[PDB]
Amino acid sequence: GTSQWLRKTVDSAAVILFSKTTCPYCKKVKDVLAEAKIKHATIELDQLSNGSAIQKCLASFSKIETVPQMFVRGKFIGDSQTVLKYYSNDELAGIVNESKYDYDLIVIGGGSGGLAAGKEAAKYGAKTAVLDYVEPTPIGTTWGLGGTCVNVGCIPKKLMHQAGLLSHALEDAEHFGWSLDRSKISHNWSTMVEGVQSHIGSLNWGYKVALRDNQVTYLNAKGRLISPHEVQITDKNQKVSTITGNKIILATGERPKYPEIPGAVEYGITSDDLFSLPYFPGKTLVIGASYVALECAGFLASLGGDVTVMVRSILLRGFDQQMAEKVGDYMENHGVKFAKLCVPDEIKQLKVVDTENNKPGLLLVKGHYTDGKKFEEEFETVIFAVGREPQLSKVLCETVGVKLDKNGRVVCTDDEQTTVSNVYAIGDINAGKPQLTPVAIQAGRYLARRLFAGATELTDYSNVATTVFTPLEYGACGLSEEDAIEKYGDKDIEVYHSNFKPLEWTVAHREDNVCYMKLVCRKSDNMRVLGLHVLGPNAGEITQGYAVAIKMGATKADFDRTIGIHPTCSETFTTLHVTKKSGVSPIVSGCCG
Amino acid sequence: GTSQWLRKTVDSAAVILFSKTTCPYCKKVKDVLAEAKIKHATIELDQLSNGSAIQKCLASFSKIETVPQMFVRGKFIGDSQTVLKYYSNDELAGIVNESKYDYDLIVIGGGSGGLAAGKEAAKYGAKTAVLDYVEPTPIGTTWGLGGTCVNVGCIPKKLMHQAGLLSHALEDAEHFGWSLDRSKISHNWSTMVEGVQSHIGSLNWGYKVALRDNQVTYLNAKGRLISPHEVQITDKNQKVSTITGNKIILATGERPKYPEIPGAVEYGITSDDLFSLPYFPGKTLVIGASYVALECAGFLASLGGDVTVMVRSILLRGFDQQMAEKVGDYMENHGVKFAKLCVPDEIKQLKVVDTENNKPGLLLVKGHYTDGKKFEEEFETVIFAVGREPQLSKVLCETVGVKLDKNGRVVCTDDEQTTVSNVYAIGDINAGKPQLTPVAIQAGRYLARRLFAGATELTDYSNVATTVFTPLEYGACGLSEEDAIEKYGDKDIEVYHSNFKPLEWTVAHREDNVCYMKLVCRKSDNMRVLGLHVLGPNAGEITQGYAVAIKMGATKADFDRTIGIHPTCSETFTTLHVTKKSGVSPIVSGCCG
Ligand SMILES: Cc1cc2nc3c(=O)[nH]c(=O)nc-3n(C[C@H](O)[C@H](O)[C@H](O)COP(=O)(O)OP(=O)(O)OC[C@H]3O[C@@H](n4cnc5c(N)ncnc54)[C@H](O)[C@@H]3O)c2cc1C
Ligand SMILES: Cc1cc2nc3c(=O)[nH]c(=O)nc-3n(C[C@H](O)[C@H](O)[C@H](O)COP(=O)(O)OP(=O)(O)OC[C@H]3O[C@@H](n4cnc5c(N)ncnc54)[C@H](O)[C@@H]3O)c2cc1C
Ligand SMILES: C[C@@H]1[C@H]2C[C@@H](C[C@H]1NCc1cn([C@@H]3OC[C@@H](O)[C@H](O)[C@H]3O)c3ccccc13)C2(C)C
Ligand SMILES: C[C@@H]1[C@H]2C[C@@H](C[C@H]1NCc1cn([C@@H]3OC[C@@H](O)[C@H](O)[C@H]3O)c3ccccc13)C2(C)C
């Protein structure tokens, strides 16, 4: 029965009020708690499906079945009459003072998932502490609250990709009858950086206002967990303190990697420096083939620069290789020099940085290919998106047993639960689960719901749709072609593929039959769609809806019976019939396939 | 069981071939037919639910169980031996090209649905004649083959839509570090006309090539049906001739109506004369509140010319009124006059059309509101968009019984079947079926499959999503708020609403909280999503993705389970929690809901 739910609720949370809609006394005590400015995790028993076992559990634990029953921090206050009596002597504010632990919940790391979990816990009754600190970049750049995705990540990346799309739109406007010259239009990088930084500062201020509104104690200081309840604090003023708390959330997030080569740390930069540096990188070298490196090089090239991507092994490792190759070809066509199959060796400085003149320095790069030829070049800026490593060592010494591989930090089971019962890890921390922003937010929210509200729903991690914001976006949800062939077998996987030219590219005279599209359908499950991909403009908007459709298993016949929206670039999804098994070329020019 | 499929196939389809995969003789006869360039509508017996029933029906009709069996007009030629002997004697072409009717299929109306049906029937082993003709009742520009959607309706609409969005993009490029002024930049409307007409001509050439490939004969002749198996046609040179056919497909479509008053025909223009108009309309009056009228007015306004919409009763009749008002306000905020609750009385001329230098002549408009106020203004052009009506009287003889309402339309049953057994109506004339291009295309393709290949699946006209390409696009799927309230009552309908802001509008300092999202769900069936609505940039892609999601039974909990794509607009649908019953303001700025 609901014995497990009652045990989970009573052993956690701050205040939980069991009530029903029919009983007027329950509504009265709810109103009394509301007018006292007391946040509570009320539960409606009548509307809950298991309306019988809850009464038995209440009789077993509270020794009384008369709802409403309000419970605080391991202490049973009593019925509505008891709460009214406590408020009569003005002790209701006094009795809501948490417990032996200083905080109901402490989040280490003010990232998107961390802040979402903090807000979710705060609006469910508990008093929450949030601890966010950013170790300064070796160059010296620093950002405020918001985490990686917000401060230096999702938002600035999309803003600069939109700038690149505007750059292409300037080219297309001449073919669209607008009196303007591409030779007479130039990009002011500094103004763009100032604007995006102003927007991100506004976002940080809004986040601070929101967190202080939910009665959440935020301290900008490094946190280091000592025991499953105790954590030490290193303030920016080196004022080390110590706070205890029953519930701990680990949201240390992630920090960009460096290659252990001479001169990389003191001369190179990462995404942390890229999104806030004043000058313009110009002739730029990018190290690493992760999707972040590719999109960064993409919108640096689209903004007048001439970037050289230096791929080590393969473009977009972990993604589908066919559309990875297509994306690389598109970058090559628009002025991106791909130094594939090469490995960096060392870097040096030739001309010192010119921060007084706001000009980038000059850096010499030495590397070697797979055959060891001495690759030599000079660049005005070198960016190291070689990967990302988490610094869980300096936040957890030996308290929790967390297995970690290369690029991994912890081992975690379902319900984001680690080995320690009262320690929870969300966001990028969990290994073997996607490192995305919405998944982190959902994990935090659902963790707060399960802890301080008694919820039973568990956050999903499968079929997580992603989109990379290259000059032309790539959005995928599900499985790749190679992954499907490896898992379900070559003969059990059917791929529906096509090439389409968006209606926005006709008069503009852009490239035709480049925007690719593919499906992954398995015959054993009635042509069930497994991996759905799109490559072209606004790929994320197209991909999100079809990810939603895939979530509960949309079949190929479902796509066939669905009717398109005219005119849109996504139409060809509901008109997919070409098969790779037949080998028919998907080059659709003029008349649609 | 399969008797009905067999009888409809033999009595309707042209060339049929019952065969299996395991039998090698069937593959041999397939190869023989392929070498003879005689395409066939083959059916794989071993790839169907009940092969034994098909074999029993064949024994009841073909008298022999041994597959394969090839049929022409349903006649039993025989087995593979008979077909091989006939091919050796070299008279199979005459056998397959002889019948009591001149053509197997006659399709009147060369629209997207018409060409789709023609190609689907042709590649399914049949001979078909597609007849299209356009009668320019106004001064007119007789566009070639391509139908309403391609020649006039859809493609030019989205082309000038992207022109308007490029106008907005140049306006907003100031904040993205682009060195221009938006004052020295002007517009070239003639460039619009020439480019869009060039693209239309390329599409027409592609369509002609496609119809030539599918061996379909196309004659630009007026269609006028006579008897259930014969039609008399009028060539371009007034050469009246007579053609008989086995089956008839009606795709007459519709043409814009006219508010018949003196001068409304010889002076004003409609959408037919809008997408090829040599001169820029400039200060324009728009008549009617249909989505075409608002789309055209927004196009001209964002292009630069001030426009005055003149709404009779309500904006966007048939859509949700809330977003209708929102979209109207969005045009109003960008310089679109709105003479709401007004109807026209007369139009006259002051200056003749100045065609020597391509300048529009001046016109005077007189009308009255609901209170009789004498509205009196001057416009050098008036565009009449008061809906479209079909000319069945010019295509269909009165001897056959059909139904027409005030707006026209043709009565028809579920399987696109008219009163006559071999006369079929698809496109914009079906009784109660949506007036959309994919509707016509799917209806034509599925009808051809059900006719000349014995298909079973029917085209779906339910939950047909749409998108109107106003300057702020509006895309909806399912139902509306008022429709849901009428259907199930207030207590059974729950609305989730959100006011969001695209990331592309942050630096640009565009409108905030203007964008909108609405979700209509029914409580009695597990919060099943009925009507979903989006109002923002690139709404068509989101709307189609979510229409595909909804069509196969998507609930709100399914939306919650989905992990969003960050950063885009569409993932805001996965964070829908505000309810209209609670009355919380949709406006979220920093917390973003
Ligand atoms: C350039 C770039 C682009 C990206 N684009 C996308 C994208 O489009 N979509 C997407 O889904 N994801 C994207 N990501 C990933 C995204 O940054 C993460 O997935 C997301 O931030 C994870 O959420 P979080 O709550 O862990 O936030 P995080 O930012 O990962 O949380 C880390 C925070 O905790 C703080 N912290 C760390 N250790 C401590 C400690 N001991 N004490 C106190 N505070 C501490 C850090 O200072 C930081 O503020 C991108 C990342 C980068 C670098
Ligand atoms: C301004 C405008 C915008 C539109 N935008 C959209 C949109 O965004 N999305 C969408 O889905 N739909 C849109 N439509 C609708 C779309 O144009 C039509 O619904 C589409 O053409 C339907 O296909 P059809 O079979 O009716 O072809 P149609 O082209 O409508 O009809 C076939 C053609 O045959 C002609 N014809 C008539 N009688 C005869 C005869 N006796 N012999 C020969 N030919 C004849 C007709 O005039 C017509 O041109 C729009 C329409 C207009 C006017
Ligand atoms: C669906 C989509 C589509 C795009 C490709 C991969 C997925 N998203 C990218 C991605 C997500 N993880 C996540 O970290 C590792 C795991 O923790 C997690 O399972 C995984 O989702 C990656 C890791 C390396 C490399 C790329 C990724 C594809 C085609 C299957
Ligand atoms: C989903 C969407 C959303 C937008 C509204 C209607 C649907 N599509 C618009 C529409 C489709 N028909 C079609 O022609 C008439 C009928 O033939 C057909 O049934 C109808 O779908 C219209 C007619 C007049 C006016 C608008 C329309 C709404 C809110 C339910």
Residue numbers in the entry:
A (entry chain A), B (entry chain B): 6 to 598
The authors write:
Thioredoxin glutathione reductase (TGR) is essential for schistosome survival and a validated drug target. Instead, both these activities are provided by selenocysteine (Sec/U)-containing thioredoxin glutathione reductase (TGR). TGR is a 130 kDa obligate homodimer as the functional stereochemistry of the FAD redox site in each subunit is generated by protein dimerization. Reducing equivalents from NADPH are transferred to the FAD redox site of TGR comprised by the isoalloxazine ring of the flavin and a pair of nearby cysteines (C154/C159).
